[PDB]
Design a protein around this ligand. Sequence first.
Ligand SMILES: [Mg+2]
Ligand SMILES: [Mg+2]
Ligand SMILES: [Mg+2]
Ligand SMILES: [Mg+2]
Lengths: 424, 420
Amino acid sequence: MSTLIEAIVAREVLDSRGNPTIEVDVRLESGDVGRAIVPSGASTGAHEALELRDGDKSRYNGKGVLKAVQAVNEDIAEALIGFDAADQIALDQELIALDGTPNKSKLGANAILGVSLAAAKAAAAAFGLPLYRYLGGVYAHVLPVPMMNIMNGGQHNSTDFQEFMIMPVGAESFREGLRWGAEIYHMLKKVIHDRGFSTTVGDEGGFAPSLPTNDAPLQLIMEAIEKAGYRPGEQIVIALDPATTEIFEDGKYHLKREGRSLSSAEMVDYWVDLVNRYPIISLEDGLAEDDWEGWALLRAKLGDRVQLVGDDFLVTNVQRLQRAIEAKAANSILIKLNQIGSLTETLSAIQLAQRSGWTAVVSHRSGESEDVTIADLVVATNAGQIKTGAPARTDRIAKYNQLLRIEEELGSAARYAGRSAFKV
Amino acid sequence: STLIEAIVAREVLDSRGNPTIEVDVRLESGDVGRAIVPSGASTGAHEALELRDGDKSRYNGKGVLKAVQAVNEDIAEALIGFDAADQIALDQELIALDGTPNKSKLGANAILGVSLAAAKAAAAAFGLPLYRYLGGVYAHVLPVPMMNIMNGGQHAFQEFMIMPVGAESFREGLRWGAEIYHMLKKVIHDRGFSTTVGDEGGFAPSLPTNDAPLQLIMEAIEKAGYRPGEQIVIALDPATTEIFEDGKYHLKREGRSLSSAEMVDYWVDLVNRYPIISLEDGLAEDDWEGWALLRAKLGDRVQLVGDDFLVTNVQRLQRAIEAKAANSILIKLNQIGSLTETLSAIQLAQRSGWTAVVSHRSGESEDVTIADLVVATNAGQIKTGAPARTDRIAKYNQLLRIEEELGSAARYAGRSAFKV
Ligand SMILES: [Mg+2]
Ligand SMILES: [Mg+2]
Ligand SMILES: [Mg+2]
Ligand SMILES: [Mg+2]
């Protein structure tokens, strides 16, 4: 096939926020070239892969990526020219070995992921296989139900909770499900203005108004689902990302707009009440980063009927995930490629969660790009769920278009996750 | 080998979440060209009309299934076995097949998609980058971007943009503009609030005066470490949409109002105080007497761009050239409908001493053809929005790639972009 690496070149490009990022090109003996743009975004922690920014305040306010570009054009290229790109595992374990650090701090998670991803793409093109087939094999065919970000809050009048998303569970295909969501998001754009507010997008595309209650965004969403012609529960469900680790502050959980506080036990009580009122199927970071005792209590009270997704709580970390699997601290994990740093390690987290009865929710980043790897990765692993944001900005829309293509390409083999995406 | 083997169209979404057509052209060589043809919509009748279904049960009538059927059936049957390397011939076949002068039978969106995808497929077959296949050996000029950093009006003076003329490369001009866009997003927060962004990246804040957005921009330029006039210059698209005529020049809120002659005198005031190199749609769509007066007054110092005034139409471009109504035209691929017709309009303006400003549409895509088209024609200028959304960043990223690929051959337009 001639899958041996000939060239590894990197350049500094811009992300969806206009911040510098790394784009890597892996050229094979065959002549095939794989290209990858690496994302970023938000304040995350608790043992994660570190990306390499320049720190040169005279270029992009210190956010430059040239040091990472160097690591690829020199260090990585020297080590991998002549390596077989068709050996993803061996390559990723060569990239990890070359770095030497456990958090990919010497070369950068961004340089390692760039090469990790471009290598796979280069190889897929060499075999003449679509990326989802190359990655997941002959049984890669499940189109995910998207968690579409139609409404925003948290911190940039606010709002205590951050993300309010809709899920087209009842649709027959990804194509129809994307239409439903698009239609509802546009109905919410009509409803918002027709209630006395403004309508411009965010970083994903969600509308961020100034509301009086925490139940108001759920009430508005319910109206937009109905006035669009869709049945709540049966056709459309709600997925929330309150990102409570933001309002934690030395124990208690501070609800400024509701003038309340309490402990994890009463924070759990709040979710149980809200879940009984709205068709909420998923809740991500309902409790804080390290409130491990709280998480298990939320699992016991809602885990039988609500998908509880570890985001900042699990940070796509295989050691944290193994603890949360054992502890019974959640039933779902949000997957971010650049939080772990390699394609092999990502697939390992996805498989560890999936084989433990958990669901893996492949997520995008705040600063995305024209790169649509997560669309082929979500199908390759038959994840059944994707978090890519509003059907608005091309950062988000590009992934939706790739899922439209993957579905078309699969033909009769294509199968939409539907209610099967969930463990409920 | 470069003969067309298959033409496949699908319905995808644009940057606004509205259906758009994507066209794939597959050659006997095995090469596939793919083009996303989205839509903007400024003013009627555009002289090239796209095909939207009108079925309100799907995407509130904004669906493009009819255009997909025109491509998969009408256009596919007619072009299979056609040499895709023959751009002009293929484009005159698409024009023939439609038969209407506005491309209303098949849809402008169906024709442009096949038109661009056929080029991409051929460029890949010869193994040449798109700008080289399009423009030949002398395609090497990197454009000075028109970076939108402020808005106002509808589709949430209208557009306020910066132009990094002083830079030594596109790469440094891109940084300059991005740093100033980030510096201004701090001056809006420190001298007010409201910050959001969308659809057009340059956030629109509720301001007290009409000369004030220029004062905010001019501060942010100096606050970022950049020299106005020298390094950074201002380009304005006031628009004249809501500023309707008869009664002439409705200026609100300032209560100045009338007329077309007084309107020209306002632009001479801002230009003599602030560094404004370019003015687009400074007067109305069909105020031909006004444009001609506007050209005689400051056409020798300022670039006057005919956007809604010309609507990328050749017949009225010829008129405005003779009438000396402007010295620049804004080119929109979707507005004319084919590649051959775009290049034709670009060359006509360029060769009669005008400049060609290659522009994006309001609902864009991941499609990045305008970056290869702007270098292929050595146009010297691009208007592709703010350094924010991926619909806009994809284009800037492509220009970075084009520059790098050119190596020592690359030349940034700079001050030479303008005829002043
Ligand atoms: Mg987060
Ligand atoms: Mg979160
Ligand atoms: Mg317009
Ligand atoms: Mg305009």
